[PDB]
Paper text:
SARS‐CoV‐2 spike‐specific neutralizing antibodies were isolated previously from convalescent COVID‐19 patients (Brouwer et al., 2020), identifying COVA2‐15 with very high neutralization potency. COVA2‐15 was one of the most potent neutralizing antibodies against the original Wuhan CoV‐2 variant (Brouwer et al., 2020).
We also obtained a 3.9 Å cryo‐EM structure showing the 3:1 stoichiometry of COVA2‐15 in complex with SARS‐CoV‐2 spike. 50 μg of SARS‐CoV‐2 6P‐mut7 spike protein was incubated with 120 μg COVA2‐15 Fab for 3 h at room temperature (RT). Immediately before freezing, DDM (N‐dodecyl‐β‐D‐maltopyranoside; Anatrace) was added to a final concentration of 0.06 mM to assist with particle tumbling. Data were collected on a Thermo Fisher Scientific Arctica (200 keV) and a Gatan K2 Summit (4 K × 4 K) camera with Leginon software (Cheng et al., 2021). The complete model was then refined iteratively with Coot (Casañal et al., 2020), Phenix real space refine (Afonine et al., 2018), and Rosetta Relax (Conway et al., 2014).
Author numbering:
A (entry chain A): 100 to 143
B (entry chain G), C (entry chain L): 1 to 27, 27A, 27B, 27C, 27D, 27E, 28 to 106
D (entry chain A): 14 to 50
E (entry chain A): 592 to 619, 632 to 640
F (entry chain E): 1 to 52, 52A, 53 to 82, 82A, 82B, 82C, 83 to 100, 100A, ...
G (entry chain A): 198 to 247, 254 to 394
H (entry chain C): 346 to 591
The structure:
Amino acid sequence: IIRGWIFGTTLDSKTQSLLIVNNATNVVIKVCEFQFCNDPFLGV
Amino acid sequence: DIVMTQSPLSLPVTLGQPASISCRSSQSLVYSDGNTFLNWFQQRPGQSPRRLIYQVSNRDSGVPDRFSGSGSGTDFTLKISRVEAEDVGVYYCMQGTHWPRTFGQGTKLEI
Amino acid sequence: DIVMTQSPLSLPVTLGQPASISCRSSQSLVYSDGNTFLNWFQQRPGQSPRRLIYQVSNRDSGVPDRFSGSGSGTDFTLKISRVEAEDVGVYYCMQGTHWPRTFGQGTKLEI
Amino acid sequence: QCVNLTTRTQLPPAYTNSFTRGVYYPDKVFRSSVLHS
Amino acid sequence: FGGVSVITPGTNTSNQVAVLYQDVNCTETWRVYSTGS
Amino acid sequence: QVQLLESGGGLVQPGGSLRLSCAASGFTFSSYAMSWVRQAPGKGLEWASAISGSGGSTYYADSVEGRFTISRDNSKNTLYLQMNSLRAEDTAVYYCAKDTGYCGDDCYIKLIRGGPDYWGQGTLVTVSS
Amino acid sequence: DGYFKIYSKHTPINLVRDLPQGFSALEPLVDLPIGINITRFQTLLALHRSSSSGWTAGAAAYYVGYLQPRTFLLKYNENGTITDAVDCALDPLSETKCTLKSFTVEKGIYQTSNFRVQPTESIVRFPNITNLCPFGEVFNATRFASVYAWNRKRISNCVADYSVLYNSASFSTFKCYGVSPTKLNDLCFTN
Amino acid sequence: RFASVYAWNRKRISNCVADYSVLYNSASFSTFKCYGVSPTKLNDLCFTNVYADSFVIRGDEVRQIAPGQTGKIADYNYKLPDDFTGCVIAWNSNNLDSKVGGNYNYLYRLFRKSNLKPFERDISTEIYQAGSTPCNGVEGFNCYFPLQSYGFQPTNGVGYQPYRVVVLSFELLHAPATVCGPKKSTNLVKNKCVNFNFNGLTGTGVLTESNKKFLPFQQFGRDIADTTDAVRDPQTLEILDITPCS
Ligand SMILES: *[C@@H]1O[C@H](CO)[C@@H](O[C@@H]2O[C@H](CO)[C@@H](O)[C@H](O)[C@H]2NC(C)=O)[C@H](O)[C@H]1NC(C)=O
Ligand SMILES: *[C@@H]1O[C@H](CO)[C@@H](O)[C@H](O)[C@H]1NC(C)=O
Ligand SMILES: *[C@@H]1O[C@H](CO)[C@@H](O)[C@H](O)[C@H]1NC(C)=O
Ligand SMILES: *[C@@H]1O[C@H](CO)[C@@H](O)[C@H](O)[C@H]1NC(C)=O
Ligand SMILES: *[C@@H]1O[C@H](CO)[C@@H](O)[C@H](O)[C@H]1NC(C)=O
Ligand SMILES: *[C@@H]1O[C@H](CO)[C@@H](O)[C@H](O)[C@H]1NC(C)=O
Ligand SMILES: *[C@@H]1O[C@H](CO)[C@@H](O)[C@H](O)[C@H]1NC(C)=O
Ligand SMILES: *[C@@H]1O[C@H](CO)[C@@H](O)[C@H](O)[C@H]1NC(C)=O
Ligand SMILES: *[C@@H]1O[C@H](CO)[C@@H](O)[C@H](O)[C@H]1NC(C)=O
């Protein structure tokens, strides 16, 4: 159920951040300047 | 913006004599790193402008060796060792130290 | 005092050919900071002397581009790429490294 | 793409006792039958 | 000024302890870690 | 040598639009910034717009901002300028020019110091009903 | 210092909610060379299929705590697995256990450091000096005096700020002997 | 090309042999300063976490790539911790990447409100406000774009020429290692007094087979005296005990 974590500051793409998640295939670590969804989820 | 005043507006100078064109800036054209960005261009009638002198005094490539520049701060001078028939046209000073890029009004040289 | 001997006393050299004038000093004209102070001046008849070459080899401003200097220590040479009618006159070497200021006897160039 | 989750139940957070938990090996050195702080 | 010592029975009998504060006048906060009467 | 060939000359009614373009050869298009310049007949020359070699960061002169659009297509080494809402004041000979400064993927416009090294042939556009 | 360090462990269990009481230690799973100033975080929760309202939350529990700089005494067994620990600032008994490097304490009285009051606020007081120091006159002077006849002037009643020179001139030498450069902004000078 | 100092790159180096004599006939370096290890001992060690930072700076800024420094780079672009293990290498690149009109692909951050932390990467592209005036765009008056390009021209002075800087940071002898100096393995001898060097950890003693088992990540065992009691051999993953000879 707990797939991963988002670490950063504003998490709105202004700055870089860490996305460490299990994407239901493998585990992916990114430092991307992502604009995150208000309610992040992975559906099954 | 940089405001450049050129002088004279026109230069009816006798062929074969020394000549000069002044370019007086509203603000210093010397960058804090010591690199100037004043560029002297010659536009002959019927031709697109071509640069003659770069960085106040440096001679460009493929241009007559009768021209050199001089000056510092807010007052610069282009010196012409000898006037030649090919010199007729309008000379412009471009100020490359700040944006927006500006030009002076131009000096029209005539024999 | 610095004693400078110029050679030849006169130079009856054919128009259009290379030419040179020697200036041999009694003592080194190189300052301990690496800056030389040998100055070549051209005095045409009827005219006040005007400097042609400064600091042994450096070309001055507003002078013909056919002249350059050379040398080191106690023996220096002015090299003339081509002799021209305007070259007739007397050339002097001034030694600016020590006081009192001195001049050589002069070399009178003729065509 | 992004979906704003709605109509959730409002509950307070709850708290628990961490017990003697939350430690890790500070380095990669093997020790045996010793104490170390 | 500190001045704290702990009165401890052996740990093979009981884990209850008492703490003495050498410079605290509890009769006359009080530079006391905890109380509990 | 370096060659810039201007096109899109002609005349367009007031309020319309026209697109100018410059072909380029003999130069590495993507490695240097390029600008559009113009001069009205009888007037001196002013800068109109610029883009870095990457085709990203752009600049417009304030007198034409919003009205003008500048773009680049590196795959054809071609610079484009589309001028909308044309005004009488826009009659001018337009040129493309190449900056002396090296300006690539990490370069931003307005940080460049120095002038243009290469100027094109030029083309003229006017505004007339 | 730029490294994001993650420690972890997996444990089998049979419970309904609260974490079990016991002891274990995590392994140094990964050190990531990231260099990002992390201040906030968010969890990622799995979604089960049944709009934005017809969502099934499944069934899970999650716990969050915070770390503090605290000294711990770790006990290693004969195979090098940590089996117990003493929290050196949990309570007087644990403090004593830590002090003696033992998990058993004999009958008696043990002296264990002091009760210390911590400051609650930072109080900073300086004279109300509003003038900026004449850095322009010092560094933008038209002419400097000959070294044989060097000049000196007193500077007073001004605020020193050395960051103003970063975009003024490039200096070849800036060497401080009395004070480290990084502390210059924290001092006040008398002469 | 080297990355702009405001957006410097870092990569991991592993599974290779380090040899610094190869550079003697490659380039002349102006700075080669090691803090964690003396240069003469670099070839005798083996490292466990080796990273190479890559960026280009101005020559006058070379003294700022060090622990305990201040300045535009040390404060706003790239900083080293006081507890620094590694070597800082820098050399003159004026003849490698300068341009007549100035190489403007090399940028640095000039204005920021906070100071950077060690190995911090500040890549924000937002406009920063110097005064109290709020800004959205504007890009002037009391607020500016924080990045500037260097005027790296082949004709400028020495202090304004570009320099290429490589900073090698690492963990030394505290973990399984991946990068070793120019050393060769030999046969291991047990039950004799041996002068040994195991992956950079030297000493004198008698090697024996150990009855201890290390965790998958643990490389060394240490005694109550904080001296080595056992080692996991770097060539064959055996656990060996080491005892003084007499
Ligand atoms: C790391 O990021 C935090 C924000 O997440 C920065 O903290 C902010 O700093 C500014 C300037 O002092 C304050 O005005 C904000 O209120 C702070 N925000 C928070 C949430 O604390 C922090 O300065 C950043 N660190 C570095 C070294 O850049
Ligand atoms: C997980 O990420 C990898 C890498 O992007 C991708 O190849 C894979 O398809 C992803 N799987 C799922 C289920 O999203
Ligand atoms: C969710 O709501 C916020 C406001 O709370 C809004 O800014 C955001 O765009 C919304 N997201 C979606 C995906 O509708
Ligand atoms: C944790 O703190 C809260 C107050 O924020 C309190 O209500 C709760 O009982 C505390 N829980 C524990 C387990 O100490
Ligand atoms: C506490 O203070 C009172 C008043 O000075 C004094 O009488 C008493 O002896 C002090 N100490 C104790 C332990 O009662
Ligand atoms: C340690 O390992 C041995 C086997 O070598 C085993 O018999 C013993 O019980 C283990 N001890 C502990 C405390 O787990
Ligand atoms: C500033 O300091 C002086 C000297 O002590 C004092 O007299 C004055 O009142 C102070 N003024 C303010 C505004 O704090
Ligand atoms: C010196 O003058 C420059 C402008 O030429 C200015 O930017 C700088 O701040 C001045 N220096 C000082 C110390 O005031
Ligand atoms: C993102 O990508 C663009 C590509 O043009 C680049 O200019 C920018 O520096 C990158 N980084 C950030 C933080 O935007």
